[PDB]
Amino acid sequence: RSLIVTTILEEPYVLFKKSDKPLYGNDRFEGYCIDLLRELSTILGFTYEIRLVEDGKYGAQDDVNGQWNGMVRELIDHKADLAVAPLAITYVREKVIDFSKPFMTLGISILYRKGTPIDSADDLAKQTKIEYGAVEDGATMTFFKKSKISTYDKMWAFMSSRRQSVLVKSNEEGIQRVLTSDYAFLMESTTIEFVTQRNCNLTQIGGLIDSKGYGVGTPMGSPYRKKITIAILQLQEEGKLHMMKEKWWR
Amino acid sequence: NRSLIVTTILEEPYVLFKKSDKPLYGNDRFEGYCIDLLRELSTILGFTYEIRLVEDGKYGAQDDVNGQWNGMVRELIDHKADLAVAPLAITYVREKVIDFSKPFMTLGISILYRKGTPIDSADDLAKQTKIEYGAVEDGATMTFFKKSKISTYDKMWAFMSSRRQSVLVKSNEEGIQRVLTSDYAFLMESTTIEFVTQRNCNLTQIGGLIDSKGYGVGTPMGSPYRKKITIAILQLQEEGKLHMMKEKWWR
Ligand SMILES: N[C@@H](CCC(=O)O)C(=O)O
Ligand SMILES: N[C@@H](CCC(=O)O)C(=O)O
């Protein structure tokens, strides 16, 4: 049977391929992650059907009901077999689902404009004229919400007392807020790298706040975890992953 | 509750003999980044352990003819150790015989060589033969070149393979020495080069990273510790401890 693969829209990992003619099925999709899934499928010999995550979320745990959502939720309830997307490997997520070894490594950092006085996270945390935030219900938000490091603690208190204002639905939404207002955006460095190759106005600020990877997500105990790990290491070793990265970051 | 058996290998600054005027015994003989990591893990997961240096002094590679493994990987396969806590690279071939925790450090193959030369990549090395070059025998680095379809890298393996017993060394320590005393460039892992170049201001990493990979804790395939150690490592990383460990030992 075909594998149900849940994913999410996120340039340049996953996007609607553009064409003069209507497109159908998996062929509607292109991107780094789309190329990766193809590769994985030819090495492992499986067929698959790509489905965008219904609630359009990556996956976080609700404070009250303690229930999950997004792509994470869909693996837990076995609605999908694989989650192929820029899905960050995190502590809280490993406790409910499995991940393959990372196909890409990265970290949280700051998207802002060039030539400003702001040069680190600490600079953002010690002022308030410059508003800042991040994708809601994402690994980045969760990092701050759970952090016990002073600066990040403070930054979360600020973001938390302004959920409606500074938190955004999507990366795209955040990027636009940076481009159109006086706003700094806490986001993942690989995605930042794509934004700055195309927005000469913008730049990463400071270094990486943490380190993490994107892995293929599976329901806990799935046979495909180990298998996809092996396929990913092959692709990496033979230089294909680096070629894919180059292709989609230009 | 039986302690775990932890296989490891000597490699600065991941693992080393603690310097002492008085003879040390058992676990007390060892210190380093990996030793620290091992202490963190044992507190989080609540286990005790016995440290054992892999007897053959090898990381682990498979023989072409017989299909048999050596080193720390052999120790895990044979179930002679419960964990491998070392700068052990997560690779395709190893992953088929053992399990790995999610990585505690990511890095890549690059080049260790002297300053003040016009050579800026592996392609520079690959086309000449005056400047000799090699890597650690039966390690993930030698294996990378041995298996690569990339023209430049295939060429470099032809060179290394033909000069096996004079350009391949038993350890990073050996390689570091050859670079320092001869016209020799050493293919090694970037994390280790970073340690070397800080200690030795006349050396430098030539070019960027030739590939990407991570170190992970090794377990026998199917071990229940794989998942738990993955979670512990992700904990240590997220709370900032792994970064502190790196600065502590890379000063
Ligand atoms: N890729 C992230 C979402 C983006 C972010 O949180 O910055 C995740 O897995 O949740
Ligand atoms: N750390 C390497 C050995 C050193 C090298 O090959 O450069 C390994 O896991 O095999």
Ligand SMILES: [Cl-]
């Ligand atoms: Cl794992």
